[PDB]
């Protein structure tokens, strides 16, 4: 669910999930177009892309449970849904983790009109 993927951005990074990848570049948040602005905002698209090969799953909403194992994220067995929401929250948290280096202040609240390009998933 929203607030656990939120919580589990804060622990691997040390940043709130909000504001700090709520309204970054043009895929981390409600946005979503062009291309993206850095490798964050790519942890972000991928992280949609993740969601949307999920159609019956709704997980801004549906809980998972998840444990640390020598620091690590184990999701840890639900509903097939709440299983693979893990998995795609865990990459996306891990992704921001890997890219804190190259996280920049300036893509948040970037414009949407500023998102040119395409991607496919």
């Known amino acids: 669910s929203l607030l656990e993927f939120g919580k589990m951005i804060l622990e691997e990074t040390g940043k ?6 709520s309204s970054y570049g043009c895929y981390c948040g409600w946005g979503g177009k062009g291309t993206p602005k850095d490798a964050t905002d790519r942890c972000c698209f991928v992280h949609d892309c993740c969601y949307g090969n999920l159609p019956d799953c709704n997980p801004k909403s549906d ?31 891990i992704c921001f983790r890997q890219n804190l280096n190259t996280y920049s202040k300036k893509y948040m609240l970037y414009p949407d009109f500023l998102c040119k390009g395409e991607l496919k998933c």
Not at 16 to 21: K, N, V
């Open 16 to 21: 709130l999930a909000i504001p700090s990848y």
């Open 63 to 93: 809980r998972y449970k998840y444990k640390r194992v020598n620091g690590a994220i184990v999701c840890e067995k639900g509903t097939s849904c709440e299983n693979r929401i893990c998995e795609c929250d865990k990459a996306a948290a």
